[PDB]
């Protein structure tokens, strides 16, 4: 998996599924928000972030490569 | 696969208020067939954290689309309440843009805490009603913070789930502003800082100037300069201060010295908790829920107060494990801070001008390490501390559990001598992320070892979101590094760090 | 008192082409009862010089309009005539604009050299025609300087009377971009840099590889790149580079471990020489009035070559006064660049990862300064060079009058490891201004005593010139000591310095 | 005077009669430019600078000041 969240979640499990495509617009569903719609602001700047972002990760982790070895004749 | 439409998010109960210790964990839920990314909170302030998680996870599927790569599950919360950074504002003025901008990378690594150094002896840039007056020593009529200027900054840090903590340095740190109100309250202010002449010094650093801790008026006005902003800041938690009292600066009150006079069995000490039992109950008297922090010091410095109430939070930035240790013994809450890992403004030399100390033109000893080859080059706490020894801080080693349980987590401070706009981001960014999963999930993987290495990509990357976002962070390596994982690594053996 | 009208600036040479050398020097002169502001200069170059000068001498009168504050009288012009800076865009790219920021902050400070390292190890991001595909170890698509990027830089700087020289740095700090044409032309790039295994060390720094010296076919691809970028770039300069080249690299090549064997008394030395033998030539060659600039490595290092001609400018960057007077000594002109003063990139620790020696939860030894605790912090040239230190160097001490003729001038390099776009003008400003004044008009007053003192609010003052005319520099001190001065001195006693 | 414009010249005196005002704008006049009016131009961005800033002095010269002495 490319994303490499920080903090690193305490606990983070992925599948093997394939990917999941977001369908046009994520849509947000609650009706446990404060009254002053906080949860409701955050996630509006969190998805027009997203979507202005279009995030490609810059660095991901691998396995170290294999650099060749120093010849003795 | 399935296509996600939706997030859905519970909160447990919608009321529990931005305060010291609120409950912050959250879940995040992905599955194969569901359409929903699934949250759960205790709190609105977890589900703001699964947002920052969410927008990491969704990226470009490299067709115009976006995708999240796998189902996850997530499980988090954070290790401890306070994790924090300290901006100085009194020596040098930052803006609110740039306020906003670090509040911005606070929230996309999961920060809660912006503990603001408002003053120093150097300026005061906060408007105060009761006293229009202070403002006069602010370093121009643009570089003020307005009671609406302070409004938007907490509401701005409110609608990121961080906490603003604020910070009006006393007893020393104190000149400018206090002495429009009245001169008297201030002593040594037009003395020489003496650092060329070390047995006479009356500061650590120029400007000096301390509160006459004695004066009758100091009380008033520190009671009434206190309670405005009190006011205004809706945390419970304030800071005080109480750093680097220093003794010589009293000498140029006549207060202080007559009053060491009358019984010449009084002690430095003394005259601390002179101050401590005065201030305190003025602070202490705001609020039932206010708590207080101050800077270590008053309980621990060379000339401390006999008994400091071990109800206030004690912030360490001397000695790292040491310090904590006698702290954490003793009863106090603490704030870590230790500056061998976690000071920011570190490794710029010094700031003091005519300084003779540069002008060495070849190595006065190659063998050690000395002020221009191999020191500190007037940087006191040099070196610059980079983002490993950062996230390397163990700061619960060689502790007791119950020594351990009285850290409430820690905070990177910013000193501001070198500091303003132009560099306010680079110099948090992105090393402040270092420490944010330190006090976050820690730097142990599953197994206990040390991940240091793991973390690498992780904040190379993070660092070219915070730029993506408006974070103007600081590079940490050429790019090279990043586009090949660990070929920039020292030892390519992987459990080189332990 | 009389108002001014009028700045005449006659010229006596609008011949004059932006080369090494050119006459800087400039009168300018404002007198109480004419409404002309007078300059002469010797050539159009001297000429932008009064002008800076004179932008810094009209203020406001506090009143909506503006004023010189007296008259005055000023006669100038530099103490030494190669005054810069060097960019790396090797680790790093820098943009165009973070690029012009630069030549800006240069302009007002009168630098005249930008020395730019344009590609390293790391990344060749510079458009080369006659190789297309070096570009493609550029970072990215949009971090590539096009033939036109370059045409608006050596543009943008010759109206501002500054000269660009280029720095394609060989045989060392050679992996990207050449071998994408080539990849038996650079050696050693696919081995581990191993300073975990320091016998088996193949570079001071990650990203190692270098131009194999012996493989014949070497020489036809740095000719034809040289060629092409001698081009594009006017200035007779051209710096080839020859920092740090190391010798277990070549052990990757099987065409040097052969020319070893084939007759065994060789060493390294030889081996230096045998580049400087074949590259050089080819360098010298481009034109007649071409002068080359190297790293001083190659005739001082360890693996120096046994003769490199008293021709090429050596750049100096260790030891301080004992590599420069050694350097002069032997007849070289020299532009010093001594890391121990004037390198802006040490003190910001270490880039390498994986590195457990910050790994220390409490001081190893109080006694003196290590590693975490007063020492280094991972960076080889600690500490960081203050605005005072790069000040005071004296560079011409103990220097004879003869060898002090041979230093034609100075380099602060910002090397670019933790820096690009984000830090590169808060890292150069406004620390390369007090170079600036110190190779322009030295550090010494009338008296022959140093200023450093009297510099204190003249470079308080320039950052907030630059930071208003768009040159992000960084803060020096806290505002306080600007509106009082000498608050902030450590010494009282002014001749402390 | 409040000015100190960096790098310090090799030789500048400054006079005692008061300040002189800019009329206007200050008006360049040469006959001795380049072909590609190299002068020209750079007064232009000199004289944009100059006007845009209306600049103040931040930091000036004066004597380190008159502090009181620790007291006996
Ligand atoms: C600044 O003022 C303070 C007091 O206001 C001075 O500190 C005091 O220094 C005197 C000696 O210089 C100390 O008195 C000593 O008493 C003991 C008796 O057991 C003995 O060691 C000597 O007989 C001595 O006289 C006094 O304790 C000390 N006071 C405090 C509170 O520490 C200080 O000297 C002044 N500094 C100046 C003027 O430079
Ligand atoms: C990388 O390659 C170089 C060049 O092949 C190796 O060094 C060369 O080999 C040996 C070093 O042991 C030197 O020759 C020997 O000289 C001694 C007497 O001095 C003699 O007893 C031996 O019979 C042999 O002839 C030779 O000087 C040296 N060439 C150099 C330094 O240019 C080097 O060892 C290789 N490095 C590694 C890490 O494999
Ligand atoms: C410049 O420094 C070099 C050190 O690399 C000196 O060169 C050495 O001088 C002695 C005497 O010839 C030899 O033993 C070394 O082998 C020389 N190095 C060579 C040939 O590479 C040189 O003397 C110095 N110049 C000075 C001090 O003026
Ligand atoms: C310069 O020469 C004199 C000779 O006595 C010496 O004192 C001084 O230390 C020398 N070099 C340097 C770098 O100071
Ligand atoms: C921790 O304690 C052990 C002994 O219990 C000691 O050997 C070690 O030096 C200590 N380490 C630190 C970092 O304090
Ligand atoms: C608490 C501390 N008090 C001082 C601060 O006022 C300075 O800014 C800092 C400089 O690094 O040094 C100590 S730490
Ligand atoms: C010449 C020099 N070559 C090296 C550079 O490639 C590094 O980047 C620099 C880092 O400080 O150190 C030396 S100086
Ligand atoms: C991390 O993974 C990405 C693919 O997600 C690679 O492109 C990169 O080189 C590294 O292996
Ligand atoms: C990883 O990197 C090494 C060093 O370049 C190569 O040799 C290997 O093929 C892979 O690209
Ligand atoms: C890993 O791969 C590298 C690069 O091809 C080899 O050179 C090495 O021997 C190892 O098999
Ligand atoms: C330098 O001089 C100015 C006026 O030119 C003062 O206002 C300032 O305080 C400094 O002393
Ligand atoms: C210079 O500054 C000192 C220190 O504040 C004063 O004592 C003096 O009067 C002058 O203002
Ligand atoms: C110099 O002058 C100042 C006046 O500002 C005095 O306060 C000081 O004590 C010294 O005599
Ligand atoms: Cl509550
Ligand atoms: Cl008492
Ligand atoms: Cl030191
Ligand atoms: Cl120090
Ligand atoms: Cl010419
Ligand atoms: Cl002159
Ligand atoms: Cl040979
Ligand atoms: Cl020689
Ligand atoms: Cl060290
Ligand atoms: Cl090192
Ligand atoms: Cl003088």
Not at chain 2, 271 to 284: G, R, T
Request: proline share 6%; with cysteine.
């Amino acid at each position: 998996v490319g994303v490499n969240p920080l903090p690193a979640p305490r606990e983070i499990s992925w599948g093997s599924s394939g990917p999941k495509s977001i369908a046009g617009e994520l849509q947000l569903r609650t009706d446990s928000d404060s009254a002053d719609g906080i949860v409701a602001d955050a996630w509006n700047r969190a998805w027009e972030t997203i979507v202005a972002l279009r995030w490609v990760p810059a660095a991901t982790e691998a396995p170290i490569s294999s650099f060749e070895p120093f010849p003795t004749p | 696969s399935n296509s996600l439409q939706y997030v859905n998010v519970q909160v447990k109960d919608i009321e529990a208020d931005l305060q010291h210790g609120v409950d912050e964990s959250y879940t995040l839920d992905v599955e194969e067939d569901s359409d929903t990314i699934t949250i759960n909170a205790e709190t609105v302030w977890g589900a703001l954290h699964a947002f920052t998680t969410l927008q990491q996870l969704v990226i470009s599927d490299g067709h115009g689309g976006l995708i999240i790569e796998e189902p996850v599950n997530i499980k988090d919360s954070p290790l401890y309440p306070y994790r924090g950074i300290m901006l100085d504002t009194g020596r040098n003025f930052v803006s609110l843009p740039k306020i906003f901008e670090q509040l911005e990378g606070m929230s996309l690594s999961k920060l809660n805490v912006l503990h603001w150094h408002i003053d120093d002896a150097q300026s005061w840039p906060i408007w105060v009603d009761v006293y229009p007056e202070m403002v006069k020593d602010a370093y121009s009529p643009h570089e003020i913070y307005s009671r609406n200027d302070v409004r938007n900054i907490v509401n701005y840090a409110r609608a990121r789930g961080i906490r603003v903590i604020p910070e009006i340095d006393m007893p020393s740190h104190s000149s400018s502003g206090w002495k429009q109100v009245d001169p008297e309250m201030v002593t040594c202010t037009d003395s020489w800082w003496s650092n060329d002449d070390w047995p006479l010094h009356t500061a650590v650093e120029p400007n000096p100037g301390q509160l006459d801790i004695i004066y009758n008026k100091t009380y008033e006005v520190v009671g009434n300069v206190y309670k405005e902003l009190s006011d205004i800041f809706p945390d419970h938690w304030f800071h005080v201060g109480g750093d680097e009292i220093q003794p010589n600066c009293f000498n140029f009150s006549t207060h202080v010295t007559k009053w060491f006079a009358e019984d010449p069995s009084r002690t430095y000490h003394d005259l601390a908790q002179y101050w401590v039992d005065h201030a305190v109950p003025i602070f202490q008297n705001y609020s039932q829920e206010r708590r207080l922090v101050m800077w270590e010091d008053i309980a621990l410095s060379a000339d401390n107060a006999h008994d400091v109430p071990k109800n206030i939070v004690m912030q360490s930035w001397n000695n790292g494990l040491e310090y904590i240790s006698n702290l954490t013994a003793r009863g106090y809450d603490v704030i870590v801070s230790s500056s061998d890992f976690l000071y920011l403004d570190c490794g710029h030399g010094g700031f003091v001008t005519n300084d003779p100390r540069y002008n060495v033109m070849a190595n006065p000893d190659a063998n050690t390490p000395n002020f221009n080859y191999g020191g500190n080059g007037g940087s006191w706490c040099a070196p610059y501390k980079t983002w490993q020894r950062i996230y390397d801080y163990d700061f619960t080693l060689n502790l007791t559990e119950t020594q351990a349980k009285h850290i409430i987590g820690a905070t990177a401070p910013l000193w501001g001598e070198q500091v303003d706009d132009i560099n306010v981001s680079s110099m948090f960014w992105p090393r402040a992320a270092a420490l944010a999963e330190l006090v976050w999930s820690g730097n142990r993987d599953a197994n206990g070892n040390k991940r240091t290495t793991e973390m690498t990509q992780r904040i190379l990357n993070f660092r070219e979101y915070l730029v993506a976002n408006g974070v103007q962070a600081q590079a940490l390596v050429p790019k090279y590094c990043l586009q090949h994982p660990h070929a920039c690594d020292l030892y390519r053996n992987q459990a080189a760090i332990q």
